[PDB]
């Protein structure tokens, strides 16, 4: 959360992004990266859509807010690499 | 002889460093021909400041 002694203490993902809503910055500080927070900011509010293994044809599934991104190989296209 | 105390003013105490609840910000500069174009700019100023 956003407090005056909480954030005053060094932020911890185990001490902010768990019991509390994990809104932001406390979702990023401890992670100190835009390549790890954005991937954790969509697995706490709307869930990880890649737990169903949606991207077929051995594609890659990346988790986003409200949807997922599928990486398809050569000769594969479509919304979910189907 | 009990006159009480003279304590009209408060007597605070501050953080060793002056301030410790800072937050991070990024420099932004006006755009041109947009009446609000506020665009990023980090050619000279580091993108993260306290
Ligand atoms: Ca934190
Ligand atoms: Ca924190
Ligand atoms: Ca725990
Ligand atoms: Ca905490
Ligand atoms: Ca606590
Ligand atoms: Ca902070
Ligand atoms: Ca910050």
UniProtKB/Swiss-Prot annotation, chain A:
Disulfide bonds: 17-22, 50-61, 55-70, 72-81
Effect noted on mutating residue 32 to Q: In FA10D; Tokyo
Annotated effect of mutating residue 14 to K: In FA10D; Vorarlberg; converts prothrombin at a normal rate but shows decreased affinity for calcium
Modified residues ((3R)-3-hydroxyaspartate): 63
Segments forming domain Gla: 1-45
Residue list for modification 4-carboxyglutamate: 6-7, 14, 16, 19-20, 25-26, 29, 32, 39
Residue span(s) of domain EGF-like: 46-82
The name this protein goes by in its record: Factor X light chain
Organism: Homo sapiens
Gene for this chain: F10
Swiss-Prot record, chain B:
Residue ranges crossing the lipid bilayer per the database entry: none
Compartments where found: Virion; Host nucleus
Protein name in UniProt: Hexon protein
Residue numbers of the full-length protein present here: 402 to 451 of 952
Note: All late proteins expressed from the major late promoter are produced by alternative splicing and alternative polyadenylation of the same gene giving rise to non-overlapping ORFs. A leader sequence is present in the N-terminus of all these mRNAs and is recognized by the viral shutoff protein to provide expression although conventional translation via ribosome scanning from the cap has been shut off in the host cell.
Organism superkingdom: Viruses
Gene: L3
Complexes and interactors: Homotrimer. Interacts with the capsid vertex protein; this interaction binds the peripentonal hexons to the neighboring penton base. Interacts with the hexon-linking protein; this interaction tethers the hexons surrounding the penton to those situated in the central plate of the facet. Interacts with the hexon-interlacing protein; this interaction lashes the hexons together. Interacts with host dyneins DYNC1LI1 and DYNC1I2; this interaction might be involved in intracellular microtubule-dependent transport of incoming viral capsid.
Function according to Swiss-Prot or TrEMBL: Major capsid protein that self-associates to form 240 hexon trimers, each in the shape of a hexagon, building most of the pseudo T=25 capsid. Assembled into trimeric units with the help of the chaperone shutoff protein. Transported by pre-protein VI to the nucleus where it associates with other structural proteins to form an empty capsid. Might be involved, through its interaction with host dyneins, in the intracellular microtubule-dependent transport of incoming viral capsid to the nucleus.
Family recorded in the similarity comment: Belongs to the adenoviridae hexon protein family.
Stated induction or repression of this protein's expression: Expressed in the late phase of the viral replicative cycle.
């Amino acid at each position: 959360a956003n407090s005056f002694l909480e954030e005053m203490k060094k932020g911890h993902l185990e001490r902010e992004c768990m019991e509390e809503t994990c809104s932001y910055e406390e979702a990023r500080e401890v992670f100190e990266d835009s390549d790890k927070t954005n991937e954790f900011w969509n697995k706490y509010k709307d869930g990880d859509q890649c737990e169903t293994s949606p991207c077929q044809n051995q594609g890659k599934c990346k988790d986003g807010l409200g949807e997922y991104t599928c990486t398809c190989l050569e000769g594969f296209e479509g919304k979910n690499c189907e | 002889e009990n006159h009480g105390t003279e304590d009209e003013l408060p007597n605070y105490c501050f953080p060793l460093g002056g301030v410790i609840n800072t937050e991070t910000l990024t420099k932004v500069k006006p755009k041109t021909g947009q009446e609000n174009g506020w665009e990023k700019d980090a050619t000279e100023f580091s993108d993260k400041n306290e």
